[PDB]
């Protein structure tokens, strides 16, 4: 009784069911609530973390001792091909919560979407949405399709939008689009809904959704670590060396008279692959990738105002265990939940903040594109072979 | 001899028996509840894939400690196993019945397995050696398995 | 129903990896079998002893990283199995694996 020396609890009970998530893609538990006086806009966006680099930026923080100096900061980069809007879902509020009113999908849905509706695309006849695509052209189904936007406009108070990822534009071997359902939090329900009928089966870029130095929240599923014990799942102190039957165990797992093992005690189980939402991840740059073929290929990513080189943020050797980034990207200060090649939903933040650390501008000075597959010391290939000279690679010509 | 539940039409029914043979009882009971009511051509072909581990036997009653496999989803169960000695002895006995069917003048394209039971045989013992100078038995549990084959028509 | 014959390179250094020191050369031969049953499509694969000696040439735990083999789909006789084709995997030696690619031989 009375431990003689107080410690705090090991681990938090706010994340108690340390369970594998029932989803691979991060669910948005809450979209930011709207005032309809704003212009009409999306709130979330799907992305894929490719790998991490770092940065050099001239920091601006009056009061600090870092002020007007250069700081390196770790960034992740999140490759974002543009989303393609497919569906519109209505939601009517009940005294039992929100309830789906009805859904209307696009005229012709793509092929990477229809692969998400199958657990075996190879054994399929690919017969999905064949009867549904006809009612956009058949006049009898079409004059009630225009009714089911007018019933939408009258009754449901929040509408959302079904979009997906263009998985052909990624180096991943997946080709199933990740089909998300995100909320349009703009104006009134007429303007909110005729901004989504306007743009069915069309693309939405990420800079139309997000911006530079606009602090957001990252939602994902963590690095799965497997079945690990108490000293790794909960970070309990190891027992002394002299212990019989085992070091790496929690010794006393309860008293006598509650006569049951409590929920608030630590024991072995599944570590990692949990659903988490990181908060307050500032965006450092919305890069865009690899424009048109007249100017044969502008690589031109990671090219700060002080660099002026023909660099690109895919490093010298490609991103390790990802591939090579050819699309738009978002780069974010700090670590981000997930493995590489993992889907993660970037999302605007609910809370408002000024705080003099958000809302201040950042200008990049430098991005290293040195090799991450070892201890790289060169950044661009011309920078290497000017320092390296000619080699025995040619040796005939 | 006399079987359990004499068939409804002994003219177009077949039967076989094997007594006192060394299989496990708990593995043979549950591979025989898998092929009960099964047609003889699906039954002979199912038993080949148990030996090749392409298709399992769900353990529904004697399931203490039995692991989980993905091939028990066809049976709507979770636990399953692949008894290759047990699925060979009631495959060798299923050959004996279709040898008796053509000696009784029966078509083998309509034979299903009407009745099949496994029940225990008298146990034969030998002994092992445990700590502190003690003897304890390794008794084997053989079985008598028994089947009626009936044409459907 | 062919009887055709090809020659390949098999890198063993890729196909055994993270294997223990005593399981390293015996897995190197049941990964020649799992190569030759995937390619030629028959469960019956015979390898000869000169290909046995070519893997075991340096003990167990140091298998030579890459070998040049040839594979021979053939047919059989004298109350053969329900599959009547089989592969003979034999060993051909070479001093250089660079720029060698799997050619079809006659």
């Amino acid at each position: 009784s009375h431990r003689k020396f107080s410690a705090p609890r090991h681990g938090s009970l706010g994340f108690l069911p340390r369970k594998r998530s029932s989803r691979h893609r991060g669910k948005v538990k809450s979209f930011p609530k709207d005032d309809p006086s704003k212009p009409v806009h999306l709130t979330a966006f799907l992305g894929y973390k490719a790998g991490m680099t770092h940065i050099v930026r001239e920091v601006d923080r009056p009061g600090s001792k870092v002020n007007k100096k250069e700081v390196v900061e770790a960034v992740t980069i999140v490759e974002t091909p543009p989303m393609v809007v497919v569906g519109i879902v209505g939601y009517v509020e009940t005294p039992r919560g929100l309830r789906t009113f009805k859904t209307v999908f696009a005229e012709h849905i793509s092929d990477e979407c229809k692969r998400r509706f199958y657990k075996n695309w190879h054994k399929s006849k690919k017969k999905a949405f064949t009867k549904y695509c006809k009612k956009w052209q058949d006049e009898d189904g079409k004059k009630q399709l225009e009714k089911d936007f007018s019933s939408m406009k009258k009754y449901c108070q929040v509408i959302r939008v079904i979009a997906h990822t263009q998985m052909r534009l990624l180096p991943l071997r997946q080709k199933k689009a990740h089909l998300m359902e995100i909320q349009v939090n703009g104006g009134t329900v007429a303007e909110k809904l005729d901004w989504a009928r306007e743009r069915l089966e069309q693309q939405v870029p990420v800079n139309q959704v997000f911006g530079q130095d606009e602090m957001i929240d990252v939602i994902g599923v963590t690095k799965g670590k497997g079945y690990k014990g108490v000293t790794s799942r909960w970070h309990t102190k190891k027992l002394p060396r002299k212990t019989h039957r085992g070091l790496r165990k929690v010794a006393c797992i309860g008293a006598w008279h509650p006569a049951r093992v409590a929920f608030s005690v630590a024991r072995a189980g599944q570590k990692g692959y949990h659903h988490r939402t990181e908060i307050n991840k500032k965006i450092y740059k919305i890069g865009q990738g690899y424009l048109i073929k007249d100017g044969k290929l502008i690589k031109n990513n990671a090219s700060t105002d002080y660099d002026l080189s023909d660099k690109s943020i895919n490093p010298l050797g490609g991103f390790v265990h990802y591939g090579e980034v050819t699309n738009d990207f978002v780069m974010l200060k700090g670590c981000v939940v997930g493995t590489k090649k993992r889907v993660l939903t970037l999302r605007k933040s609910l809370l408002v903040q000024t705080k003099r650390r958000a809302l201040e501008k950042i200008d990049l000075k430098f991005i290293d594109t040195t090799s991450k597959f070892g201890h790289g010391r060169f950044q661009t290939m011309e920078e290497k072979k000017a320092f390296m000279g000619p080699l025995k690679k040619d040796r005939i010509a | 001899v006399r079987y359990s539940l004499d068939p409804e039409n002994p003219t177009k029914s077949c039967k076989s028996r094997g007594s006192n043979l060394r299989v496990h009882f708990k593995n043979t009971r549950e591979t025989a509840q898998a092929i009960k009511g099964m047609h003889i051509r699906k039954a002979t072909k199912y038993l080949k894939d148990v030996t090749l581990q392409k298709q399992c036997v769900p353990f529904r009653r004697y399931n203490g400690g039995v692991g989980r496999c993905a091939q028990a989803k066809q049976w709507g169960w979770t636990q399953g196993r692949w008894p290759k000695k047990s699925a060979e002895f009631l495959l060798h006995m299923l050959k004996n019945a279709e040898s008796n069917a053509e000696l009784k003048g029966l078509d083998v394209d309509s034979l299903v397995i009407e009745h099949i039971q496994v029940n225990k045989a008298p146990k034969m013992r030998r002994r092992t050696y445990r700590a502190h100078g003690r003897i304890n038995p390794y008794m084997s549990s053989p079985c008598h398995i028994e089947m009626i084959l009936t044409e459907k028509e | 129903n062919e009887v055709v014959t090809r020659e390949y390179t098999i890198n063993i250094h890729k196909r055994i990896h993270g294997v223990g020191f005593k399981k390293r050369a015996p897995r190197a031969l049941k990964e020649i079998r799992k190569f030759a049953m995937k390619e030629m499509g028959t469960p019956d694969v015979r390898i000869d002893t000169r290909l046995n000696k070519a893997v075991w040439a340096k003990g167990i735990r140091n298998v030579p990283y890459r070998i040049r083999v040839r594979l021979s789909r053939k047919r059989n006789e004298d109350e053969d199995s329900p599959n009547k084709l089989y592969t003979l995997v034999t060993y051909v030696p070479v001093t250089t694996f660079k720029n060698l690619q799997t050619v079809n031989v006659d």
Binding site: - | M124, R125, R126, R127, H132, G133, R134, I135, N136 | -
Partner: protein, 39 residues
Amino acid sequence: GVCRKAAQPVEAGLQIPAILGILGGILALLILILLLLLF
């Protein structure tokens, strides 16, 4: 014999391991761990 591993031998033995199972276990009080309860 022609019928001596079949009709001599299955009678010959087949229950001869049955020597008592246990002959007491005279190992003298396995509670050798001194416990002695508060004295």
